[PDB]
Design a protein around this ligand. Sequence first.
Ligand SMILES: Nc1ncnc2c1ncn2[C@@H]1O[C@H](CSCC[C@H](N)C(=O)O)[C@@H](O)[C@H]1O
Ligand SMILES: Nc1ncnc2c1ncn2[C@@H]1O[C@H](CSCC[C@H](N)C(=O)O)[C@@H](O)[C@H]1O
Ligand SMILES: O=C(Cc1ccc(F)cc1)N1CCC[C@H](c2n[nH]c3nc(O)ccc23)C1
Ligand SMILES: O=C(Cc1ccc(F)cc1)N1CCC[C@H](c2n[nH]c3nc(O)ccc23)C1
Lengths: 266, 272
Amino acid sequence: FYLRNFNNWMKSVLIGEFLEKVRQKKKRDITVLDLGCGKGGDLLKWKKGRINKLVCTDIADVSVKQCQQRYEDMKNRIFSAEFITADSSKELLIDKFRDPQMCFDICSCQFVCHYSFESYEQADMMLRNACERLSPGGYFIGTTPNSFELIRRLEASETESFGNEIYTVKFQKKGDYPLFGCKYDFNLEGVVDVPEFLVYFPLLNEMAKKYNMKLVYKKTFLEFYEEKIKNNENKMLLKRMGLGCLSKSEWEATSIYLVFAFEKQQ
Amino acid sequence: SRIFYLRNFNNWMKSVLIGEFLEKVRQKKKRDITVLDLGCGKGGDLLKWKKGRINKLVCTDIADVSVKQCQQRYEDMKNRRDSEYIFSAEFITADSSKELLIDKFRDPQMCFDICSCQFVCHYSFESYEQADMMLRNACERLSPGGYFIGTTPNSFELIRRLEASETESFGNEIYTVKFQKKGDYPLFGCKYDFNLEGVVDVPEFLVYFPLLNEMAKKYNMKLVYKKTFLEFYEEKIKNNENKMLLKRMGCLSKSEWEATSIYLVFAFEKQQ
Ligand SMILES: Nc1ncnc2c1ncn2[C@@H]1O[C@H](CSCC[C@H](N)C(=O)O)[C@@H](O)[C@H]1O
Ligand SMILES: Nc1ncnc2c1ncn2[C@@H]1O[C@H](CSCC[C@H](N)C(=O)O)[C@@H](O)[C@H]1O
Ligand SMILES: O=C(Cc1ccc(F)cc1)N1CCC[C@H](c2n[nH]c3nc(O)ccc23)C1
Ligand SMILES: O=C(Cc1ccc(F)cc1)N1CCC[C@H](c2n[nH]c3nc(O)ccc23)C1
């Protein structure tokens, strides 16, 4: 519960930074693509951003319905929203938008990207889906496990495994970290245990250039927290959310991750 | 200096590597063994090839002054009484990240059983087209079943020492590494300076070895193994020949091991 809340604060400040930048740029028709939305934990964040149109997509059809339902519920207590079930690493989302020439101001992709580094075609496909329809000046923002921190911990271990009572990471073998299909197990004890894939961030950065994007920043969770905490509204939100200090086991689990922000060039 | 001791330790590491794949080549075929020493320098492995009893060697390096020194060292070797069987050699000055070596061989159709690239291939990661071209020169003319072997800095260990560093610099009295910015490690062009006290002050580029691995597939190569300098040493010491050899050439100082431990060895095999 406490980790889920900490990560929402991270996502809130990240989305909020770039929602603000879009609002200084655009005058109307703010449109967002939430690639890998899950059950919809960011719907509230997009409503607070006063955006105009949301596309929500995930590979789990059950998650897409729950996300749709949560939207309908909050509509009836707002942006227009679309809900598409699809593998964004194998399908073109352009094939499924109500309007196949719509463009986006932000693609947000939270804890989703690394599942596409199963293979070259899949990672390229998810990037296309996240950046191809970005308007000039648009943003591709997200969160994903920091490959360096995962390799560092795996080396320093004895087993192909490290973790604690919250999380366990088991690698399929050691010393072999292919650009694609480097598989490992992320055991969220006991929510989910999902196959994940390593993302060498310099690879992702170079790949995004195919879609005319440039790095805005790449920040470990630590860096992101330390910089974003100095802001006042960010600190206000942290207290208003019930958040103080992470426990050591929770810090270890969440320091695995980094945040990234790219921007569509002209 | 104690550069003398590092050189002799590095020569052991290269002997053990060269030897493993020479013996693999010697068995897969009966015949003449032909070798590409890419970035040969002054010819510090010429003796390793003479003990390997190979039949044809090609030495190439971007530095013409070093190529001539390597040729000069080869001709002195053949003035000895124990060089009846010594390989024949040709010496070419060329930028192997820019020029096609195929158009400079005496025989433009010749083929290699081994391309040996020791402490060279990281200079080519200046750009993609240079890393690609050095790999073409190293692997395209390899016979099927041939080998691409070498040594190069372990980028994971450079970045670990950098991140952990207090400034953009780390080293000791033997070496110093200075990057240009922390956090920004591009696939190509990641420049850092490498100063080996008294020996050499050169710019180098980071090689993400997984990227090197993938790019080598384009020339139909497959990884045989990659081992850090430590990992390689501990496995190879177990064999008595390797160890007897290590002692015929003491143990390593602290600041010396810190300097050699940045490196990894690799071996690729050309597929059929
Ligand atoms: N190939 C793929 N295409 C689209 N979504 C995928 C996917 N692979 C995994 N996912 C989705 O990515 C999600 C990861 S959990 C992240 C959920 C949400 N964005 C949040 O931050 O709370 C899961 O819902 C999973 O179904
Ligand atoms: N682009 C390039 N093409 C060919 N050789 C290069 C090169 N860039 C650097 N080199 C050579 O690589 C050498 C690295 S020093 C290594 C020397 C030798 N291989 C040995 O192990 O003893 C230098 O002599 C340098 O001239
Ligand atoms: O929300 C986060 C952030 C986070 C939370 C706690 C941590 F300890 C570290 C990170 N996630 C990263 C880890 C797995 C999370 C998750 N829950 N359910 C899933 N189903 C899937 O199919 C794929 C992923 C998940 C998604
Ligand atoms: O032999 C090794 C291995 C090694 C030696 C000592 C160590 F402490 C650890 C490793 N080298 C790596 C370091 C630079 C060496 C070198 N000497 N002269 C050069 N000229 C150039 O143009 C480029 C590189 C060099 C080559």
